[PDB]
UniProtKB/TrEMBL annotation, chains A, B:
<protein>
    <recommendedName>
        <fullName>Inclusion body protein</fullName>
    </recommendedName>
</protein>
Length: 131, 131
């Protein structure tokens, strides 16, 4: 019944200096999970139940950078398990979509592309879906 | 020479339901530290060197809440070791100030008051200053 809201946090300075997004990103969600990508790809996940609505938004640690989610691609999108769409006002946009598991329960990989002050960088988070 | 930029992340829904800010806040900074207050007061800290400039800003996980830093009080302010001031445009404000340790090095406690959609709630982070 409750939405799962996900905040991606980017260390933008470091992302741009290295061109490595994964090592410079964190996830915090309303499940009270927090993952650092610096500690591994395995940490960049969200837990959710079939039928739940998911909401993503992205922010930078520094006030001087601007960051947006440009696009989602990959497995979760290919198989139509969750197709987020862009919403909100210019300024704080966010992306939302419902999880349509096939009453299966599984892992769904996806590719999120972010624009970090106009630099497009991709990373590979995943969903863990239970029934 | 580099600024230390600090992002406070609030689970606003949960903060307001409990009236407990500490258990529902995270810190991530450009030192690549991440602390959850849910795991204890001891985690809500920032490392810095004497003479360094510190920058704080606050965001909510959800796009539906608005959150601001209202005020800093307590030890760090009393002793004039770091007096942040408010800056930026309406929308993304932030607070900044330089650390003037007495070439001592120490812990400085402070009280940050945040407005969570108009609800004023306080918590007790701290600085760890080295020379």
């Amino acid at each position: 019944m409750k939405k799962v809201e996900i905040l991606m946090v980017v260390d933008a300075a470091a992302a741009l200096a290295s061109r490595d997004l994964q090592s410079n990103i964190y996830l915090i969600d309303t499940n009270k999970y927090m993952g650092s990508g610096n500690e591994g790809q395995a940490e960049l996940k969200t837990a959710c139940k079939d039928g739940q609505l998911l909401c993503w938004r992205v922010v930078a640690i520094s006030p001087d950078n601007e960051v947006d989610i440009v696009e989602f691609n990959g497995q979760m999108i290919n198989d139509r398990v969750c197709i987020p769409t862009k919403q909100g006002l210019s300024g704080d946009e966010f992306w939302e979509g419902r999880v349509e598991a096939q009453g299966q329960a599984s892992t769904q990989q996806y590719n999120a592309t972010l624009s970090i002050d106009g630099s497009r960088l991709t990373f590979d988070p995943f969903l863990v879906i239970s029934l």
